[PDB]
Structures are given as C-alpha cells and as structure tokens.
Design a protein around this nucleic acid. Sequence first.
RNA 1: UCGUGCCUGGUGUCUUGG
Lengths: 115, 59, 225, 258, 47, 66, 39, 71
Amino acid sequence: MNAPPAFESFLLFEGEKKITINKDTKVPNACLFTINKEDHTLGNIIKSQLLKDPQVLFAGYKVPHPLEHKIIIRVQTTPDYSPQEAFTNAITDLISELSLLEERFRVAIKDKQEG
Amino acid sequence: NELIGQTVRISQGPYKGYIGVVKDATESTARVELHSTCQTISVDRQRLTTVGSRRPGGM
Amino acid sequence: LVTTRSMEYLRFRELPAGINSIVAIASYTGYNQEDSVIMNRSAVDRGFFRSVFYRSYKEQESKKGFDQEEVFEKPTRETCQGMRHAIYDKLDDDGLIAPGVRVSGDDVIIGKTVTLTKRDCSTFLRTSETGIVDQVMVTLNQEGYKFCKIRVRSVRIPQIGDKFASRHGQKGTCGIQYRQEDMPFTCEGITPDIIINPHAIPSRMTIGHLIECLQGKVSANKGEI
Amino acid sequence: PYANQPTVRITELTDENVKFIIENTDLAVANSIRRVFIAEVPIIAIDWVQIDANSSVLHDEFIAHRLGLIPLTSDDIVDKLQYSRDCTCEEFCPECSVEFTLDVRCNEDQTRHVTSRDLISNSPRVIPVTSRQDDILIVKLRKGQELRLRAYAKKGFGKEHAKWNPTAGVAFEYDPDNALRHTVYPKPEEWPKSEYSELDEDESQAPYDPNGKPERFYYNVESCGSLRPETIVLSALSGLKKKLSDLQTQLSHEIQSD
Amino acid sequence: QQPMIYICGECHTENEIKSRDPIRCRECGYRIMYKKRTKRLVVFDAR
Amino acid sequence: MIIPVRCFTCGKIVGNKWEAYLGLLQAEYTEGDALDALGLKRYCCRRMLLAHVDLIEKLLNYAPLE
Amino acid sequence: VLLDPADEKLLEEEIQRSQQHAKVVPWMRKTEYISTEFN
Amino acid sequence: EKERFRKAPPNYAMKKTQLLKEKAMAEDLGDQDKAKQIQDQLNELEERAEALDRQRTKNISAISYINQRNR
RNA sequence: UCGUGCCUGGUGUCUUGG
Ligand SMILES: [Zn+2]
Ligand SMILES: [Zn+2]
C-alpha cells in the first residue's frame, strides 16, 4: 500500500529542480550541488572526473537516504576557480569521453563483424 | 459530484493508461482506486477520461 | 536445492514452501544490520517471493421473525433507511459483487436488507484489505436459506517490513530493496537475491545455514539436488 | 585537468552476448556504464494487459505478470518511440506503444501450451523472440478453458521494473590479478584463476603495484534477446551521455539564473 | 433485461436465476453455482 | 505453479527451457548435462530448472468442464 | 565417391570437457516432478 | 427429464455416478441386478479411464515418462 | 425550477507475533 510508484526515481515532480547550487559557508570556494532524481549512476562518474582536476581541493558525493531519490555533490576548488566551473568541466569532458568511447566501440564492432 | 463511482482511465501524466474507479471527487481533483496496484491516488480531474461499462441490446 | 532424504515422504517436493535464493552473507550498507535482510528489487519485479493473499467472506439470509426477514438485495437511497457512505453500485442486482471486479477497503461486498422501511445489513470488505474478487459461489445452507461465499485475492508483492526466514532459524524483516544495478556482484553478473547481516551467525551458531549455502552451490553447478 | 582517452577491444561477439575490453578509463566510468546496461537502457516490454476472458488455472495478474516478463525485439524501434507518459495521445499511439493480442481456446483433448506464439503483434518488428528453440510457456489449458486478452507494450527501462532490463547478466571485472590489492586474500592460493589472468600456474596473485589505477575493464554483456548484445552497449553509452547532456542543460540554467 | 447468469458447480451449464428462486441447476439437481466473470473493464499493469 | 519466465537473480529467460529440459530427461541425461546442453552457465539460472516444481500439471487435473 | 570416415574427419578444422556432472557422489540424489501416476 | 439424455460422465459427475452405481449393486440381494451393475460399472470405468488417458495424452504423458525413469 | 446525512455488535475460547 504505501510503496512509492517506481517512476519516482527518475521523473521530476512539478516544482522540483534538477540541480541546485548552494554556496557553502564553512570554507571559501565551496559549493553543494543537489541533484534530484539521480543516484549512484550519475554521481559517481562526476565525482571521479572531478578528482582528475588539479585545481580541485575536494570533491565528493552522497546519497542522503536510499529511499529518497537525491544526491549531493560538494566541490571545493582553488580561489582562482569556481566549483561552478569545476562541475561544468567534469560534465563537459566526461561527455567528451563517453562520445569518444561510443565512437571507438562502433568501429570495433564493424571490424569484428567480418574482419 | 456526478462521476463518483464511475470507471475512469488516467490519460495524462505519470499514470498514463492506468484504469480505476472514482472513490471521491472535487471541483478540480478526484481520488481513483487503480485497478492494478493495491493503492488509491489523488489526481487532477482533467487527467481522467470516462470509460464506462455497459451492455447494449438488452433483449 | 539441498534436501533431507526424509522430506520425500513429507511430500515437500510436490508442495514446497520457499525459493532457492542466491543468498550473500554480507554487511552491505547497514540495512540488514540486526535480524534484517536486503532483498533484490529486480528479483521481486521478476516475481521472486510474489504471493496471492486470498481472503474469503460468508453471509446467509434468515427468517428473523414474523416482521423481520433478510434478503440479498441492492440497497437504494430511497427505501433502505440505514445506509452507508459507500459505493453500492459495484455489485449487481443480485446483491452480490461479480468475480473480476476491483474492491478496496470499506467497499460493499454482499448487499443485504432487513425489513423493519428496510434496514441496511450489508457486508463490507475489511478495512485496508484491497483485493480483487476471485470467485463468487452461491448455494443453499442446511436450513434451505440462500448462502454465498466470496473470496478476494490481493497480489502481495514483497515490501519493506515483510518477514522472511531461512531453513535454520534465521528470521528477518526485509530492511530495504535495492535494484540489480545497486546490488554487489561476482565476476559475472550474479547479484545476491537476499543479503543477510553476518552478525546473525556467530551468536546463533547456525552452521547448517553456511553448509547449506555451500552445498546449494555445489548442487546448482553439479546440476543435481 | 581533462578526460582520459579509452580504447575498446571486442573479444567475443555472438547474437547472445558481447565480450569487450575497455582500457584507459576511470573505475567510476567503467562501473556507471554497468549500472546503465542494467537499469537505464530502454527496451519495449508488455506493460498494459486488458483481460477479456481468463479461465486458466492461474490468477488474473499471474497471466499479466508473466506477459510483462516476455522480452520483445526492440532494436530498430525503441529509439523511435515516445515514453508512454510523454505521448500526446489520450490512450495509446503507434508512436508510443505496440499492441498485442492473445486469443486461445483449448478445444481438443490434449493440453494446450499457451506459448509466446500466441501473442499476436500489430507491428511486425516488435514481436516476442521467435524469429530464428522453444517458446516461453505462459499457461497450460485443459479441455474447455480459455484465455482472451489484449496487451500493449510501451517503452521503459530497468529502473522502473526489471522487465525492461535488456541484460541476462553483465560480467564486469577489473584487475584480474590482485595487483591493486583491492581485495585481500587470507590464503591467496586457495583461489582459482580469473578468465583473464595474465599469470602463470606458479604464482598466486600479481605482486603489489603501489602507484597504479584500474584500467582494462573486462565486460561480458549477455542479451535477454530484447536487443542485440552489442546494441545494449551503444544504447547505454548514449543513455549515460544523454543524462549528462541533460544535466549540463539544467546546470547552465542554474548558473546563469543565480 | 439481465437475468443474472450463474454457472452450475457440477454440470458447468449456464443457469438464468432471478430473485425469489431456489439455487438449483436446471440440468441436474446440484445446489452449488458460481457467478460468471464481470463485464467491467479489467486492466492490469504487467507489474 | 509454472516455470518462471526469467531467472530471478540475473534475468535470463528460462521460460522456454522447461519442456526442452524434460525432453532431455526423456533422453538418458544427468540433470547436470541437461542444464548444460540448454546453455545455462550461471548457478543462478541452473537453480530455476533444478528447483522448479511443476504444479500446473496437478492443477490441470481439476477440470472445469469435461 | 571413394571416401572414408578417416578422410571425413580431416575435412574439419577443429571440432574434436566437464565430465564431473555424472559423478557418483553417494550423497547426491536426482530430482522428482509431477506425474499423474502414484500411490 | 433433463438428467436423462445428454452424455453424463464428463468431467466430475462420473465419480459420483460410479459411487452411486456401486451403492446400487450393494443394495441388491438379487444376483441379476448385481451382475447388471457390475457390467455397467466396468463399462463406465473403461470409458472414463480412456477419457482420462486421452486428456493426459499430451504434456502429461511426457512428464509421466520422465518421473518413472528418474526414480 | 430543486437542499436530506455517522451509522456501527457484546460475549468466550484456541492458534499465532516481539
Ligand atoms: Zn501515445
Ligand atoms: Zn540465472
């Protein structure tokens, strides 16, 4: 009876934002990104990409409760670098990776197939 | 309200295609017992379409 | 998958009560921590531990007295004085719900009136039961009175708080359900079906559970029970 | 400060499973793709069942549940369909669904194997897996029992219900030899060798490699028949790439609007 | 004009059964009958 | 009641394999080779056919009519 | 044609396993299903 | 009238009719009634057993064969 | 062109839940 409908993990309600930036106050140059209707799929790749950034002091992600479909991404950079642009870069270049991987997989297929 | 107790189909939003019966209704919303899941949901009354259940020819 | 020789004669293999689940014994993410278990949502979607709960209802009509008499009848907001807030139209003119109709909590099942104009005496689905009417039977009791039984089925999908148990005394509630994307996995994509917290074994000394989990593995690969 | 540059190597390609090797990528990317194969690739599956006549020995929802789990050939069509919740139609559209139909009566004396043969599609492509080996048993009927229903298949993905998961089993693996010591064996010689182990039969695990990342992720994607096993992959990469593109859009809005 | 169609529990024949009637099959004197399926819209999510 | 459509664990279709499996037991096979000849590699999927009790065969004896 | 099973075998490239399924293992029986003929 | 003409045994009614036939045989002190009953009973038994094996001819038959060879 | 609304069970015993 109480069960959430299963579409609740990916479908945005009416009024809910996808993504939500919050300036953290406890250290300079720190933000908290709150993703709605996301889980460990989307939150882990962003985190791991952020760790590649040399200008990034701290990067992490959490799932506040596995019954509530939301992740938190906390980014802290160097004063010459907003976490806004950290976060932007770690999506941009990660898309560039997956696009290059998709392209490379495709050719590998067509070579396998009679080759 | 008229359609309380009638068979309706949810035609819009996340529950598209779910059949149910109207257990209660307002000027803007209804409560529908879904035929399938063990649950009653509240929905905007404009998301619904009446299906009805009748037989003709009565002879 | 691991049987006793004496469970042949109990006819247990003909009429079994349980499923061979790929159990892991792991402290995965805390939700199994204290007699609890983490179940696979993707397995439950595939019907793992899905069940039908049948509930069944009975009613008969009588000669109450000289002035008093019961009869199977749709009440109406016109003559029947006593009457509920409910939806009486779910049931046809027989005064009995048809099989196949959806019912919820405090819906009317068996329409019944008793003459005083007529009082309402009808039977209602138990509060918060929520099933579908599976079959409706009608007959005569010993007394030669009209007598019906109605059974209603609820498809009870495993949910957080349902109680699982093992063959060894290892009871536990479903503490959360993760999907196959979220479960741990072997060098192939064999996720667990159930994950039980290790802390259940050491104090309880159910070694037979481990052995069973061990032999069941042998049984599935040797392909012989 | 930028992306790594992965390389792919297909080892085994059948009409049932794919074995491929991804090199030069992060552990997170290599696992997130695994999550997406399972839960976030779209397929077509039965999701709406209207039961007209059911006289079988099973329930009503038992029939409907079993119909849900039957895989449907999706490759050419699934990236064309609307999700049901996104189609403008008041009921169902050929742009947002495929319609199915089962009409079976056991008249003969012998028992009736209600198989996936009986599911009649309106679309010639989105059929159950029958094309080119028995058929999924739905029910068994006796002399006088029948089953009439019509069903609709819609687009969905495994995050809702397992029915939309395209895979049998995804075999993810990295570092076959314990070079990272990500796992710590109490007795490292009691352990059988990986499929992938570049190790002799003398030594048990690779020597400890202090400075070193995972690369070389070994995959074995097995299709349920609903897609080709190599289409599951191109679709997942495109799904994850699409979630990130969407995310970026929402992000850019958030940035400029602060 | 609907006569309420029952099914005999032992003959399996359809029987037309109005009010104030003995619940007997008209084929053979068996005393159990079942209601036939509803005519209403029955729809399931394969789920 | 009736053989599941999918291995609950992994999700491989086993629904089509039950008739075939009993057919391979009309042949003189060990269950271990029957399971192998059908191609069930995982010890998840292999449990489905070993462990399935076919009760639909018994429910079919309760004729409605004739 | 003039040909032999010794020749036939040589036409194939490579066709020519896990034999332990059929082990005795006195602690391991066989399974039982639903017939229509019993006590 | 309506119990007379239509083919009586299938599906469940033959079991109760067989019992009734036995009772009719047993209630008779006359040997002629007993032997007529015996004959009648055997005939209906045969007919019924044929019908049962016919229905079970397929897909039941197949499982019967594997169960006898598995034990 | 219309205006009515909380009915509604008591007693015993066995089974089972932490
Ligand atoms: Zn549409
Ligand atoms: Zn499996």
